[PDB]
């Protein structure tokens, strides 16, 4: 049995970072050589393991989380980081054991006039727990007047769109991220 890594990396759609997918990898043989031997991956950072020593270990379960963020924000997909993505969208624990990889997906995820399918949470009253993320659409009460479900002043929708556009600099271009957790 080959682990379904191709189902995660070469997927047609990717999730928004606030609603990122997790596929639980179980009861299979995983060949991590086809991964670290690829020119597409602009980032291949591993924590707690060596990328070439991967094909020598076993684990009970492997988790593959995937989503789309900006290139500016891949630096937050790492243990001990802060920022609107780590704090309010995707949080890695400080004792993280696994690999974080990313690659530029401008030609896939950005479009002329802006791509408004990819969203991130901009407002949350508390930091996410590592491996705790919310799907909520309740509007954010920024004042003392309750909002009563009416988006207005001091009553903001919690998500914005990236509006990925193919013309911006590299830091604003969409990047697809896959995080592998080992346990």
């Amino acid at each position, epitope marked *: 049995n080959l682990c379904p890594f191709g189902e995660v990396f070469n997927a047609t759609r990717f999730a928004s970072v606030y609603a990122w997918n997790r596929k639980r990898i179980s009861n299979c043989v995983a060949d991590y050589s086809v991964l670290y031997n690829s020119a597409s991956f602009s980032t291949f950072k591993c924590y707690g393991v060596s990328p070439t020593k991967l094909n020598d270990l076993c684990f009970t379960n492997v988790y593959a989380d995937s989503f789309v963020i900006r290139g500016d924000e891949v630096r937050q997909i790492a243990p001990g980081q802060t920022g609107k993505i780590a*704090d309010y969208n995707y949080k890695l624990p400080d004792d993280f054991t696994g690999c974080v990889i990313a690659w530029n997906s401008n030609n896939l995820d950005s479009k002329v006039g802006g791509n408004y399918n990819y969203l991130y949470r901009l407002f949350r*009253k508390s930091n996410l727990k590592p491996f705790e993320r919310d799907i909520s659409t309740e509007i954010y009460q920024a*004042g003392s007047t309750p909002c009563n479900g009416v988006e207005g002043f*001091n009553c903001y929708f919690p998500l914005q769109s990236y509006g990925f*556009q193919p013309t911006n*600099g590299v830091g*604003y271009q969409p990047y697809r991220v896959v995080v592998l957790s080992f346990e």
Partner: antibody
Amino acid sequence: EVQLVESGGGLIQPGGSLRLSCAASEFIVSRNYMSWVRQAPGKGLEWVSVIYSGGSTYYADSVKGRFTISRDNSKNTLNLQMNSLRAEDTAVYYCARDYGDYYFDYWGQGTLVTVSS
Amino acid sequence: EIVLTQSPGTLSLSPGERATLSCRASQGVSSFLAWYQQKPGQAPRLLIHGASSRATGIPDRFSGSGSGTDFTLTITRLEPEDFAVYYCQQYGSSPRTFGQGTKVEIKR
């Protein structure tokens, strides 16, 4: 109706410390991105520090290790603890609400900080 | 950091004329640019954000354009209370930086 009122400015000696305060009226500072922006007399604008709605804090490189941003939920107050003040830091200090750590849509009137011997 | 250079430094026009202010970024900031107005002795006021979206209560004679490194702010029909100092501020990367300002004085 909404309001941001700075306080705690004045004359201070070099190397001394100072604490700035900003009272909010309709905004709950604990639920917002709040920022401090300073303006030297006759020069431009310079962002100082921000506190995220979740507690994360960031500082401009010119005030790192010396300034500390904080807030106080029982009094709905944004605070800036300035230490080791130089001449340099003489400016009018504004508290602004920060919309998503992007732009500054609502400002206060400012308080003047003078660092002179 | 991004250095925002505004031009011209001083813009001397008569009320009713059309004002065009430029702001250049040292490197691209996409549409993450805001414009502010400051009158002497009082605090800055948000005019547009997102390079082209007016803030709340901003008259339609204010409009923004541009993306990447080139931005323009345009007052179409200058009212007498539009004569002030105008700053641009980027929130694309790095520390958030302001322009050094353009004054729109009155010509006579």
